Amino acid sequence: LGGINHSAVANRYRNLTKEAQQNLYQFAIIEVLSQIREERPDKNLDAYNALIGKVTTVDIYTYGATNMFFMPDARGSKTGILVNLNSPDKPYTNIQQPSDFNNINDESFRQNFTSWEKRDGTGWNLGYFNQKTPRTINISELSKILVERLDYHVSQENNDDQILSTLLLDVLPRSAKGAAREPLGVSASGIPFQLEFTFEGFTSPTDELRAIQSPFSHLAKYFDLLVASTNGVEYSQEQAENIGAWIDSGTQLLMSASGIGAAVSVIQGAAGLTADAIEGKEIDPLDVISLSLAAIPGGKIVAKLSKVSKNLGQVVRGGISIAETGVDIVGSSRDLIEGFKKGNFTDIINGLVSVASSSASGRPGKSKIGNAIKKGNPDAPLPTRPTYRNHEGEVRPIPTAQTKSFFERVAIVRREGLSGRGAIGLDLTAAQKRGAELSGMGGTISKSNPNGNVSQVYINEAEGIEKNITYRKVPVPNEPGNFENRLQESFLDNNGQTKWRDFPYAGEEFDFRLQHKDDFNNIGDLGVGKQGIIAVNNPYSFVHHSHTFEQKGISNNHLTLESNAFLTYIEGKKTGDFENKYGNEMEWLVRKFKTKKNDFDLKDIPDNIHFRTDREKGDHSLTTYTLQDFITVVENAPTKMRKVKNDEFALNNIVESMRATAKNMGASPDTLFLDVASTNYMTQLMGQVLTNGRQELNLQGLSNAAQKLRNG
Ligand SMILES: [Mg+2]
């Protein structure tokens, strides 16, 4: 499945400067001279030295023949050595007598002649070289003449790309070998010892051409070096989406990055996805594709293929791109299949999976990903990035396919998969949803669900299983008398009795909480004198609303900000590395919902902070500072909060939680005012969050800061 992409080979060669092409031929010659030298007794370095810049003179005969020349054994001699730089097996032949020319008949010689010229050899052979008298040049002029001969040969023929790739098949690996012999590195623009290069890892000549656009192509590395020898960059979202490098397949594979053997599943899933695309003829063997492995919030990874936009320009080389969210493996589809067969992507995919493993954000960051890749190989460079040539001839790295919209697309597909649950959904009133009703949240009230919290169908995308989840009030399994809230799944035992169990691990509760991020439960109490505490599922929520049920309606309705939970989380996120500071972030957020206000790592704020509307305030005095002012500043993440903004997923959910909570209590951020009694708590909190406690803030300063943000 494939053959050689001749234009990809030919493009690499054609886009070299003339100087770099001469150098390529020069290194090929050097390789063949080394072979001649070692295989002969005297060990003369004349040709070697007269070529490698000694001022002794060495005669060469040139021919109307590509890749070929003669090294006479003496001035004007008809005997010596015939060189064919493109011959698999006879790169040099000793010509001791005329008849030696007659015995040369292989296609690797015949190919070096144009269609027009090929007839000269008659049963084809080089016997006719005996009647011709070639011109003599000094050897220092040879690589130039060979370059000009190849250009002419290509111009004499109609099939430019194929003739070019054929005529270079065996020249290129010899050139690469010649370059690896260059002591202490190849020169860059007249400066010696600049460019390290080894021949190790090269496959057969044909396989190197087959793999020219593959991620670790050795020949692409050699071409890149030749470009660097003669002279000699990171993207933003607008530039990327303006470049439009990648076209979605429209199909994706969502997998878990956690659990033992997750990495094996990801590798197999990704190789599987590539194999299916080739069979279904969505993708051709030689098409350049980006296999994206992108982390997804909740410790998941999506594999998704993209085909390169033909609008982009020429693809120069495949490679590995590292995004903040994952890696892309770029090469021809056939290169990716072969690479999977060989295990070439295993260190990369192991590294990525280990850091996506239990990521709340699906955003381990470029540095963590890069480090995890280099872990499976002491401390090497980062893998070479794929590159393309734009319309004006500039070679640039290809942007990642893991753009903003890419993830929007991923989210759409997932949500279409989630559209068949809950036979008939319950038809609840706004008052029931606000938790204002004595009858409960709309579920059926029972002993272990006294609040009547509504059951929810959790679709476990991994297990392919549906679970029914209710936020229930259960005994604190030790101390009698007190109860706590827990999300639990119901199931039938052997006898048809309904039993209940916890989420087995934080990851699953986290995913449930995201999937049902908009729903509220009463985690407080229910009855006439009692405090209902109404809280959204969103795992990034640091607020809730609450009230006391009256004989009719409610009273003391207010929004509460969870000061220390918020403080601790933000201080953690402020470091830029939450995991380093506190645990697994996913575990931290799930655990937050079970933790009381004064039981977080930070306990600095003496109480929770309260906002209420003017009309509902009762006898609470209000400030003119609004939840909206708070949200505006939080959303902007200024000054010491700046790094929180690196995790947009977390920050958007924090804000959206706040807005949903304001709305659900029948209010809005601009109609919710901070209690006078919360003043000091708020200024202390923001002072710390925004300035590390270096600046004393007041509410007016906080309101003005919000005002400044809306003005811009
Ligand atoms: Mg032509």
Q: Please give the distance of CA 431 from its chain centroid, rounded to a whole number.
A: 45
563: closest CA among 620, 610, 501, 505?
610
* Cβ–Cβ under 8 Å, residues 337 and 267: no
Q: Where are the alpha helices (DSSP H) in 357-424?
A: 366-375, 404-417
| Cα separation, 524 vs 293, whole angstroms | 42
φ, ψ for residue 675, nearest 5 deg: -60, 145
Question: Is 430 a domain residue?
Answer: no
Residue 14: both structure tokens together: 């054609």
Q: Which of 462, 681, 427 has its CA nearest to residue 560? A: 681
> What gap in Å lies between CA 516 and CA 539, rounded to an integer?
10
Question: Is the domain of 266 the same as that of 295?
Answer: yes
- What is the C-alpha to C-alpha distance for residues 631 and 165, in angstroms, rounded to an integer? 62
Determine the Cα–Cα distance for residues 280 and 689; give it in Å rounded to an integer: 54
Spatial distance between the Cα atoms of 581 and 571, rounded to a whole number of angstroms: 9
Q: Which domain holds residue 644?
A: 538-712
Any domain includes 699: yes
In the three-class reduction of DSSP (H, G, I as helix; E, B as strand; rest coil), residue 254 is classed as strand
Q: At what angle do helices 6-14 and 218-229 cross, to 10 degrees?
A: 20
Which pairs from 336-345 meet CB under 8 Å and 24+ separation?
336/271, 336/274, 336/289, 336/291, 337/1, 337/271, 337/274, 337/275, 337/278, 338/211, 338/214, 339/214, 339/215, 339/216, 340/267, 340/270, 340/271, 340/274, 344/215, 344/216, 345/215, 345/267, 345/270
Q: Does 201 lie in the same domain as 92?
A: yes
194 C-alpha vs ligand 1 centroid, how far in Å?
36
Placement of tokens 């009309």 in the chain:
615
Whose tokens are 């494939």? That residue is 2
Distance 59 CA to ligand 1 centre (A): 31
Contacts of 268 by beta carbon, 8 Å cutoff, 6+ apart: none
Q: 432 lies in a domain?
A: no
Cα 112 to middle of ligand 1, angstroms? 15
Residues 492 and 563 in one domain: no
3-state secondary structure of 325: coil
Rounded to 5 degrees, φ, ψ at 393 are 85, 5
Question: E-strand spans in 101-168?
Answer: 135-138
Within a domain: residue 530? no
* 319 SS3 class: strand
Centre of ligand 1 to C-alpha 109, Å, is 20
Q: How many CB atoms lie within 10 A of CB 613?
A: 18
Give the E-state strand segments of 339-494 in sequence order: 387-389, 395-397, 456-460, 465-475, 483-492
Start-to-end Cα distance in the chain: 57
Q: Which residue from 383, 382, 381, 283 is spatially nearest to 335, judged by alpha carbons?
A: 283
Query: Residue holding tokens 């070929």?
Result: 68
Q: Contact, 443 vs 526, CB < 8 A? A: no
CA–centroid distance, 66 to ligand 1, in Å, is: 14
For residue 397, the CA-to-ligand 1 centroid distance in Å is 30
* 557 DSSP β-pair partners: none
Residue 425 lies in a domain: no
- Dist CA 94 CA 47 (whole Å): 16
CB < 8 Å & 24+ apart, contacts of 373-379: 373/320, 373/322, 373/327, 373/347, 373/348, 375/351, 376/346, 376/347, 376/350, 376/351, 377/347
Give the whole-angstrom CA distance, residue 228 versus residue 282.
36
Taking the centre of ligand 1 as the mean of its atom positions, its distance from the CA of residue 160, in whole angstroms, is 5
Those residues with Cβ within 8 angstroms of residue 585's Cβ, 6 or more apart along the chain or in another chain: 359, 360, 361, 572, 578, 579
Please report, for residues 46, 47, 49, 141, 616, the alpha-carbon distance to residue 37 in angstroms, rounded to integers and kept in the order given. Answer: 10, 10, 12, 21, 98
What gap in Å lies between CA 246 and CA 305, rounded to an integer? 9
Task: Give the C-alpha separation, 229 to 239, whole Å.
Answer: 29
Q: Structure tokens of 703? A: 């309101």
What torsion do the CA atoms of 441, 444, 445, 446 make, to the nearest 10 degrees? -140
Whether residues 307 and 281 fall in one domain:
yes
Letter string b/e over residues 548-559, b meaning 16 or more CB atoms within 10 A of that residue's CB = bbeeeebebbbb
**Distances in whole angstroms, Cα of residue 121 to Cα of each of 91, 111, 149:** 19, 12, 19
Q: Tokens representing 588?
A: 């931290």
Question: 167 C-alpha vs ligand 1 centroid, how far in Å?
Answer: 13
Pairing of strands 465-475, 456-460: antiparallel
d(CA 182, CA 199): 11
| d(C-alpha 305, C-alpha 170), whole Å | 34
**Cα–chain center distance at 306:** 13
Quick one: tokens of 265?
């599943």
Same domain for 507 and 613?
Answer: no
214 lies in the same domain as 300? no
In angstroms, rounded to a whole number, what is the distance separating the alpha carbons of residues 153 and 68?
A: 13
Co-location of 590 and 688 in the same domain: yes
The backbone torsions φ and ψ at residue 142, rounded to the nearest 5 degrees and listed phi first, read -70, -50
CB atoms within 10 A of CB 59: 19
| CA dihedral over 625, 628, 632, 637, signed as positive or negative | positive
Whole-angstrom Cα distance, residue 73 to residue 77? 6
Q: What is the dihedral of CA 470, 472, 478, 483, to 10 degrees?
A: 160
Cross-strand bridge partners of residue 337? none
Closest CA to 172 of 213, 214, 215, 207: 207
| Contact yes or no for 507/591 (Cβ under 8 A) | no
DSSP secondary structure of 506-558? HHHHHHHHHHTTT-EEE-S--STT-EEEEEE--TT--EEEEEEE-SSSEEEEE
Q: Ligand 1 centre from 153 Cα, in Å? A: 8
Boundary residue ending a domain (229, 261, 291): 229
Q: How far is the CA of 155 from the centre of ligand 1 (A)?
A: 4
Distance 164 CA to ligand 1 centre (A): 10
Burial call 413-426: b when 16+ CB within 10 Å, e when fewer: ebeeeeeeeeeeee
Q: Give the separation between CA 219 and CA 316, rounded to whole angstroms.
A: 12
Distance 166 CA to ligand 1 centre (A): 14
Rounded Cα distance between 445 and 574, Å, is 42
> Which contiguous run of DSSP H or E holds residue 27?
helix 18-38
- Burial label, 225 (beta-carbon count in 10 A; 0-12, 13-18, 19+): buried
State residue 189 phi and psi, 5-degree precision.
45, 60
Output the CA torsion 634→639→643→646 (10° steps).
60
Could you tell me if residue 706 is inside a domain? yes
- For residues 167 and 224, membership in a common domain is answered with yes
- Ligand 1 centroid–CA 274 distance in Å is 36
Distance CA 317, CA 223 (A): 10
Phi, psi values for residue 265, rounded to 5°: -65, -40
Q: Are residues 347 and 390 in the same domain?
A: yes
Residue 307, CA distances (Å) to 8, 341, 535, 633 in order: 16, 21, 44, 41
Calculate the CA 133 to chain-centre distance: 60
Q: Return the SS3 of 620.
A: coil
CA 575 / ligand 1 centre spacing (Å): 61
What percent of the chain is helix, strand and coil (3-state, nearest 5)? Answer: 40, 20, 40
Residues 88 and 36 in one domain: yes
d(CA 425, CA 444): 14
d(CA 204, ligand 1 centre) in Å: 27
In a shared domain, residues 213 and 243: no
For 183, other C-beta atoms within 10 Å of its C-beta total 6
How far, in Å, is the centroid of ligand 1 from the Cα of 159? 6
**Spatial distance between the Cα atoms of 28 and 37, rounded to a whole number of angstroms:** 14
Report yes or no on 531 lying in a domain.
Answer: no
Distance 156 CA to ligand 1 centre (A): 5
| Strand, coil or helix: 435 | coil
For residue 565, the tally of other CB atoms under 10 A from its CB is 23
What amino acid occupies position 209?
L
Integer Cα distance of 636 and 651 in angstroms: 9
- Going by the DSSP 8-state scheme, the letter that residue 171 receives in this structure is H
Work out the burial of residue 659: count CB atoms within 10 Å of its CB; fewer than 13 is exposed, 13-18 middle, 19 or more buried.
Answer: middle
Measured CA angle at 618 (ends 613, 623), to 5 deg = 50
The first and second tokens of residue 85, run together, are 């730089």
Give the strand pairing for 314-317 and 387-389: antiparallel
Helices (H), 187-342: 205-210, 218-229, 237-243, 262-279, 333-342
The answer to whether residues 687 and 697 touch, using CB atoms and an 8 Å cutoff, is yes
Give which of 306, 305, 303 is closest to 269, Cα–Cα: 303
Give the distance (Å) from ligand 1 centre to CA of residue 177.
29
CA separation (Å) from 474 to 441, 478, 546, 612? 17, 11, 21, 31
- What is the CA angle 572-576-579, rounded to 5? 55
- Ligand 1 center to 382 CA (angstroms): 39
What is the DSSP secondary-structure string of 31-84?
HHHHHHHHTSSS---HHHHHH-------EEEE-SSTTEEEEESSTT-S-EEEEE
Tell me the two tokens of residue 366.
Answer: 């470029």
Residue 526, in any domain of the structure: no
Residues 19 and 161 in one domain: yes
* Cα–Cα dist 511/537, whole Å: 11
Domain end among 179, 200, 229: 229
Q: Do 330 and 321 form a contact (C-beta atoms < 8 A)?
A: yes
Q: Check: CB of residue 625 under 8 Å from CB of residue 674.
A: yes
- Are the CB atoms for 232 and 225 separated by under 8 Å? no
Number of structural domains (the chain) is 4
**DSSP-assigned letter for residue 126:** G
How far, in Å, CA of 302 to CA of 270, rounded?
A: 9
CA nearest 67: which of 136, 150, 160, 189?
A: 150
Q: Please give the distance, rounded to the nearest whole angstrom, from the Cα atom of residue 154 to the centre of ligand 1.
A: 5
